[PDB]
Fold this protein.
Amino acid sequence: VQLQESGGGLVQAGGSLRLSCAASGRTFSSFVMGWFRQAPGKEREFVASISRSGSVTRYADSAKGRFTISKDNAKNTVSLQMDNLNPDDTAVYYCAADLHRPYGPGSQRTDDYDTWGQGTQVTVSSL
Amino acid sequence: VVVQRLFQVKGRRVVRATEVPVSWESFNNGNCFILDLGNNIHQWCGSNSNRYERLKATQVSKGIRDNERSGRARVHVSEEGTEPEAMLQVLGPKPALPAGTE
């Protein structure tokens, strides 16, 4: 119902960041969650998703081997651990929820996600 | 506004899809129900619904999507115990459900 992210910031190339999103408010059950990113001046693009129970995950091509999505079902939180970042990973990162999907991880389509956080900025330098 | 409507799918030799009020008060465990939320179509079948009702439910959901939404709507199948959050956001918490009738 309510999503709030945290953990972004400025990081050196090759560095790591851990984003987290808090699910608060009226929730009646578990639901699908995913992470998207909006590069400066571009559109939102799929990064990773995770199923209601946290048992199944799905990753975009650019995220394979580098990022890990997880969730803590007790706290109602999902996290995106981002390792070995490079400058074109610079974006606002949004956690989104697909409240309609009964099973499986999220799809890679933005329009399947109806609930969105406010986003956390992620800048990857080049020094 | 996006549509919100609920269809009771009930029968055996003859299965009918009847529009009923959008409420858990319309549900029972022996029929299937289609909660049409416009961009999302929820196909829910009671634990005691029969094969004719389940097949009719699948036909009704695809009919709404393909013929009333230009093919551009997701059909989501759930069963008792797997209802998705958006269904509970519309109807409220699930209560006990009565048995269906002949």
The longest strand of chain B covers residues 5-11. Chain B has one domain: 1-102. Residues 1-102 of chain B form one domain.
